[PDB]
Write a new protein. Structure first.
Length: 802
RNA sequence: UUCACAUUGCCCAAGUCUU
RNA sequence: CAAUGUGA
């Protein structure tokens, strides 16, 4: 239950396509490099400060120790191309910097020869410690030149300024990572951008925050309304006077009246520093320890450069950010290439110390474009849809199994002035028309239609409906826009009363269109238990010859900066042989834990419901797990694979179905581009839907592939990466690749191939719904949150999450 | 809250050292 | 899913 399976074979399906990847081939020398442990007292220092210490320590002790150019990981690991005068002997060094003790112990040799063998068929697995060393080599210089953020590097772009307002601006940067592959070692490079605080005087920072055209408007002290807004923006930020300080608070009193025991601030700077403040009417920054009385005037302070903006951007700052960084696929391709030529890695003195060479051109890789499956619809017509470039339509087609809607109601929470009875009548006309074409006929008018206001009217209205109207199938809820009513409608519908609801924005009622209404019917039919369509049965892979269940799993974590909100784990399982219908389980779990804690219980529920639905027991389980990074593969696989087994074992026997465990990663830094201009699709110029890459850039020994299953509308498509961590079923590359691709076509909310398999997509929708059930509510704590996300008995077997 | 795609927010990573 | 864009 541990080591992943090797690649069984290579795919042969689909026509070939010429691609370029943002991977850059690396030539590594076959020489031993020397690894040294370090220790710096004190070691509470920031990572950047540790690099400084070693920086000077290396030059201060050039003679008799560092005669050459070593690299340092910022904590405790130092690498040299040639050995030092050491042995395993410690060396206590005393270093000085505008008071540190640095100890240096040898630890081991790192053979780059053993890496060539691992990348070959010679060695079974890739030595992590070797990949780690190469990474520190490539990161040494940029970790000091630029501002490190994750695996990326950022800097103020020379000659340009991308202001966001509020004292913030866009910095451009790039991601950098070292990866083994079937071919060589690869440097993965991709461009990015993020928000940074402008390194400007605090005075200018105030003006942008408070929206002043200039200071001196006015020369009166700030209103508490202004002083609070400004305090919220600058608190926690670092400022400089030679001397750096983090702002912990903004004083209430102006510098002229704000005092401290040794006297007003404006007077202290008059006497001690001989400075007369130009704006004494303004408050002071309290800096350092919150429990001391260190106050700086705004005039003598700058925001120190290189501080990323962690807080959420405003709506306008966001809009600005999007415009500044949006790029078609070809444009992004050129931005990466331009960056790399300018990057000039090969002139890096440290890269060259270790004799590493980096190719300045994108690796060429051959992909295949898989054929889409045929989609089977219903009605008498029984039409077959044929996806083209990842898209099809429902025109002249009807659901495989459409629901007849006899009893339904409308509840309009939009103001009657805004959303008229006429609007509602007209909306009902068009929806019924579209529902007829669509195969899910709404046979009559709503049995109930009443205006209402506020979250309070929801539950009493829904209780009345459930009691009054027998066989009620659906409540359509009209909402004015963004409102807390939505979360309430879903609380009551999903968890309290177990009633199907379909919300619609007022603006989409006032002005409808055939495409919107059609998409709206896709959701409604599913919610009411229908089947929109199915994969052409005879076109499916062999796996469907025996009972199989398809599982999707995801964990969604709280936003950045949050500290106490729970993580939400969601698992969904197919309930028919199509596969189309899914049931869902959801749990709250520990803050920022990726491992699905209660998975065994969740899978047991799904297996039971599968048997109740199909009267089969799955002979195979295909589990698609979203969002686990490589550094978590072993941990996650260990717990979750055994959890699936546990579920089976506890159910019966000797019930041991084959498990295929697949990790899906949509958010990585691999990008694929069309080599030939006439292969690019649409305005965004992306690779076509179905493009598959299982060679060259993929893993040297293990079973992984990229599949870009969707049409790229805008920007640069993210090709989803799939990694097989376990496979009892012994899939070939072809079967697995085709299976995954076909499951991307079974997503009920649209007639498009989506970017990840339906089961994994549904798991996201389930987690996000739970998050809505928990709005403003996030042992005794756990049970409260657990109950909030527990859906009504009548909702359990439904696709309420659609 | 019609829907997908795209940027960010999510595990790993990153970050968290006299007035 | 939220903010912001591109689209159907
Ligand atoms: Mg996740
Ligand atoms: Mg960590
Ligand atoms: Mg959106």
């Amino acid at each position: 239950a541990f080591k992943p399976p090797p690649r069984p074979d290579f795919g042969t399906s689909g026509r070939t396509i010429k691609l370029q990847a943002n991977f850059f081939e690396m030539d590594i020398p076959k020489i031993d490099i020397y690894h040294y442990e370090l220790d710096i007292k004190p070691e509470k220092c920031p990572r950047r400060v540790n690099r400084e210490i070693v920086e000077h320590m290396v030059q201060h002790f050039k003679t008799q120790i560092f005669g050459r150019k070593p690299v340092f990981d910022g904590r405790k690991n130092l690498y040299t191309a040639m050995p030092l005068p050491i042995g395993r002997d410690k060396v206590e060094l005393e270093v000085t910097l505008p008071i540190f003790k640095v100890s240096i112990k040898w630890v081991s040799c790192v053979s780059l020869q053993a890496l060539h063998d691992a990348l070959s068929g010679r060695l079974p697995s890739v030595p992590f410690e070797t990949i780690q060393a190469l990474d520190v080599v490539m990161r040494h210089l940029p970790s000091m030149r630029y501002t490190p953020v994750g695996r990326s590097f950022f800097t103020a772009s020379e000659g340009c300024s991308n202001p966001l307002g509020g004292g913030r601006e866009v910095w451009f940067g790039f991601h950098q990572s070292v990866r083994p592959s079937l071919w060589k070692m690869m440097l993965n490079i991709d461009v990015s951008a993020t928000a940074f605080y402008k390194a400007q005087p605090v005075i200018e920072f105030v003006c942008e925050v408070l929206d002043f055209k200039s200071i001196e408007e006015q020369q009166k002290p700030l209103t508490d309304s202004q002083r609070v807004k400004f305090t919220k923006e600058i608190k926690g930020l670092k400022v400089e006077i030679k001397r750096k300080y983090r702002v912990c608070n903004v004083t209430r009193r102006p510098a002229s009246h704000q005092t401290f025991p040794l006297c007003t601030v404006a007077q202290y700077f008059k006497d001690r520093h001989k400075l007369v403040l130009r704006y004494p009417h303004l408050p002071c920054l309290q800096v350092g320890q919150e429990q001391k009385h260190t106050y700086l005037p705004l005039e003598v302070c700058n925001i120190v450069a290189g501080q990323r903006c962690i807080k959420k951007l405003t709506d306008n700052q966001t809009s600005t950010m999007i415009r500044a960084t949006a790029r078609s696929a070809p444009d992004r391709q050129e931005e990466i290439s331009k960056l790399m030529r300018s990057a000039d890695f090969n002139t890096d003195p440290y890269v060259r110390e270790f004799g590493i060479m980096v190719k300045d051109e994108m690796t060429d890789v051959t992909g295949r474009v898989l054929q889409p499956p045929s989609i089977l619809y219903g009605g008498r017509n029984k039409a077959i849809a044929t996806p083209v470039q990842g898209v099809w339509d429902m025109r002249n087609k009807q659901f495989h199994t459409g629901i007849e809607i006899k009893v339904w109601a409308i509840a309009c929470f939009a103001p009657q002035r805004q959303c008229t009875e006429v609007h509602l009548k007209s909306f009902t006309e068009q929806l019924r028309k579209i529902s007829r074409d669509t195969g899910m006929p709404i046979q009559g008018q709503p049995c109930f239609c009443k205006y209402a206001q506020g979250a309070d009217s929801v539950e009493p209205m829904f209780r009345h409906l459930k009691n009054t109207y027998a066989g009620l199938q659906l409540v359509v809820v009209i909402l004015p826009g963004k409102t807390p009513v939505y979360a309430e409608v879903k609380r009551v519908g999903d968890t309290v009363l177990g009633m199907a609801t379909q919300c619609v924005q007022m603006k989409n009622v006032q002005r409808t269109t055939p495409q919107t209404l059609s998409n709206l019917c896709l959701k409604i039919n599913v919610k009411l238990g229908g089947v929109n369509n199915i994969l052409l049965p005879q076109g499916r892979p062999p796996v469907f010859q025996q009972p199989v269940i398809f599982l999707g799993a995801d964990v969604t974590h709280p936003p950045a900066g949050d500290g106490k909100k729970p993580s939400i784990a969601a698992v969904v399982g197919s309930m028919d042989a199509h596969p189309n219908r899914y049931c869902a389980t959801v749990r709250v779990q520990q803050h920022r834990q990726e491992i699905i804690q209660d998975l065994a219980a969740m899978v047991r529920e799904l297996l039971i419901q599968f048997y109740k639905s199909t009267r089969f027991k799955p002979t195979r389980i295909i589990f698609y797990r979203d969002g686990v990074s490589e550094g978590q593969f072993q941990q996650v696989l260990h717990h979750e694979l055994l959890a699936i087994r546990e579920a089976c074992i506890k159910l019966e026997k000797d019930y041991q179905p084959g498990i295929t465990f697949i990790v899906v990663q949509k958010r990585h830094h691999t990008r694929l581009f069309c080599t030939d201009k006439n292969e690019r699709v649409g305005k965004s110029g992306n690779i076509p839907a179905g493009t598959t890459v299982d060679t060259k850039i993929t893993h040297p020994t293990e079973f992984d592939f990229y599949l870009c299953s969707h049409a790229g509308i805008q920007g640069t498509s993210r090709p989803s990466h799939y990694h097989v961590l376990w496979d009892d079923n012994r899939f070939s590359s072809d079967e697995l690749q085709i299976l995954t691709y076909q499951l991307c076509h079974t997503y009920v909310r649209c007639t498009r191939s989506v970017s990840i398999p339906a089961p994994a997509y549904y798991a996201h929708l389930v987690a996000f719904r739970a998050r809505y059930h928990l709005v403003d509510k996030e042992g005794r704590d756990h049970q409260a949150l657990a109950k909030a996300v527990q859906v009504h008995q009548d909702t359990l077997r439904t696709m309420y999450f659609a």
